[PDB]
Write an enzyme that holds these catalytic residues in place. Structure first.
Site, short mmCIF file in Angstrom:
data_model
loop_
_atom_site.label_atom_id
_atom_site.label_comp_id
_atom_site.label_asym_id
_atom_site.label_seq_id
_atom_site.Cartn_x
_atom_site.Cartn_y
_atom_site.Cartn_z
N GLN A 78 37.41 44.23 37.78
CA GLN A 78 37.69 44.68 36.66
C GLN A 78 36.31 44.39 35.78
O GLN A 78 35.31 44.06 36.69
CB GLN A 78 38.60 43.66 35.79
N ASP A 83 49.09 32.54 34.31
CA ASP A 83 48.18 33.18 33.23
C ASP A 83 47.40 34.40 33.64
O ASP A 83 45.86 34.24 33.82
CB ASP A 83 47.21 31.98 32.77
N1 LIG Z 1 45.85 42.17 25.26
C1 LIG Z 1 45.45 40.83 25.54
N2 LIG Z 1 44.25 40.55 24.71
N3 LIG Z 1 45.96 40.13 26.59
C2 LIG Z 1 45.37 38.66 26.69
C3 LIG Z 1 46.33 37.96 27.89
C4 LIG Z 1 45.76 38.41 28.99
C5 LIG Z 1 44.86 37.29 29.41
N4 LIG Z 1 45.37 36.04 30.07
C6 LIG Z 1 44.52 35.09 30.39
C7 LIG Z 1 43.49 34.37 29.06
C8 LIG Z 1 42.84 33.41 29.29
N5 LIG Z 1 43.42 32.12 29.79
#
Ligand SMILES: N=C(N)NCCCCNCCCN
Lengths: 278, 280
Positions: B32, B161
């Site tokens: 990414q 996560d």
């Molecule tokens: N559309 C969004 N902004 N999504 C955010 C959640 C995906 C990232 N999780 C990891 C976050 C860092 N621990």
């Protein structure tokens, strides 16, 4: 590809893609604009700030009104300071106990523009502008001066655009003293308190001033579509009112879309660091 | 325009914007696009594929609710599994629980970990140690969490996560995966994952809820005002065994000294728009 953005302290911004501008007018008190957004219906903007978006305003008007209404044993006489868009009184009128609601808005243009271009009140504003509404009485005037001379309200709800900023009715202990005296016994006063994260000091300041004036004070929050959510609310009661309990039975009948009377306890979410500063 | 702005646009044409001092980085990894920004008032902003991952000033509003409720509801979370969490926020919070003996973090994009350790540094030295396999409790593995879960088990708690369920990441919200996650849990055991914007990623939420409900013994949903994401944000919980997620160990919570999640008022963690509740 029009874009509407409202910036808050620390550079946080609430943005909406918009299809077209519908109206821009200047009143004796503020600039009033109406845009047709892409995914939230129509947006009412006052001096560049979001008042509401038709497809989401219930996330504000519901938690602003019903919690207090459902916590009062018999909300017969209600006062709404502001509420020019009509949303609050619409929610208030859903309660059968209500016999009379007085609404004091200083800017008539907000009311007429809302009634003709926003249309979320369902005809309450027009019926009220002509003084033909059975329960609603409209008074084009200053809300502060009004509660200096008037009393007898079971519930007082402040939903103002804040023409001269938030201080007018938030940092005025004089005002809170008049509001408490205006409440019936028992009575409840509720007001939005701004952004939980970006308006924290102010929120805490209003809470402490209310704490000395009312018999008990409470705070709560709610995810409001259109604002820098979460949004904070403050409550002040006079006499026998336990804001921690609501008549859930009466709540089922309102057909709420956002506020959940059956899970009233979840209305009190608030970051720990903030709760510790109270 | 007079300054620099960063915006994440969500469905319905809604945007979360931040005025920034300048863009510190952009590295297209194998998986990414990773970017880092210095904001005017929220510290450093970590973004992936244009979506906000975190702002150093306020990230605890995400890692605290993502981790502690599940951790505090479990009677004894000795072994923990984290899928994703490249920034290190989650493992930081997990390691605050003294019951923890070992933690396994499975992240697929190592760039995200290196970039976070150098330009974000919210992990308190944990990311570096694990990268050179030196951490006493944490062990890092660079792989797909979806595959690791097929041959591994024995976890009291599983924290997912990841990024939004859009692409390869989507499989972490699939039933096949939930089934294996369920099997990988000890008894009792608890699984938790971020589940998207409550108001704008509602379908992601509802879809995952139903899939998890079909698989676990009990499933729960909750939300929290996460700084930097469209607010509020949803979370889904899957339980195996007698654990009542409606209850957490408050005394243990006190020792954590949290700034956002309040374990003393655990009941407030379940706010959710009535219309969404009614759609479950
Ligand atoms: N559309 C969004 N902004 N999504 C955010 C959640 C995906 C990232 N999780 C990891 C976050 C860092 N621990």
């Amino acid at each position: 590809d029009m874009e509407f953005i409202e910036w808050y302290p620390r550079g946080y911004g609430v943005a909406f893609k918009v299809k077209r501008k519908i109206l821009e007018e200047q009143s004796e008190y503020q600039k009033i604009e109406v845009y047709e957004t892409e995914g939230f219906g129509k947006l009412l903007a006052i001096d560049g700030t979001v008042q509401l978006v038709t497809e989401g305003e219930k996330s504000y008007h519901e938690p602003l009104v019903h919690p207090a209404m459902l916590a009062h044993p018999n909300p017969r006489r209600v006062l709404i300071i502001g509420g020019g868009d009509g949303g609050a009184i619409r929610e208030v009128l859903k309660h059968e106990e209500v016999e009379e609601v007085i609404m004091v808005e200083i800017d008539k243009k907000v009311i007429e523009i809302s009634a003709k271009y926003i249309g979320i009140d369902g005809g309450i504003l027009e019926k009220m502008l002509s003084d033909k509404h059975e329960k609603g009485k409209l008074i084009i005037g200053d809300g502060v001066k009004f509660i200096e001379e008037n009393s007898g309200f079971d519930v007082i709800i402040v939903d103002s655009t804040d023409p001269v900023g938030p201080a007018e009715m938030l940092f005025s202990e004089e005002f809170y003293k008049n509001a408490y005296r205006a409440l019936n016994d028992p009575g409840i006063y509720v007001t939005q308190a701004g952004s939980v994260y970006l308006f924290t000091d102010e929120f805490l300041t209003a809470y402490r001033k209310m704490r000395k004036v009312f018999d008990k004070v409470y705070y709560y929050s709610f995810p409001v579509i259109g604002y820098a959510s979460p949004w904070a609310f403050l409550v002040g009661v006079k006499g026998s009112i336990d804001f921690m309990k609501v008549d859930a039975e009466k709540g089922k009948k309102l057909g709420l879309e956002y506020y959940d009377p059956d899970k009233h306890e979840t209305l009190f979410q608030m970051p720990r660091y903030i709760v510790q500063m109270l």
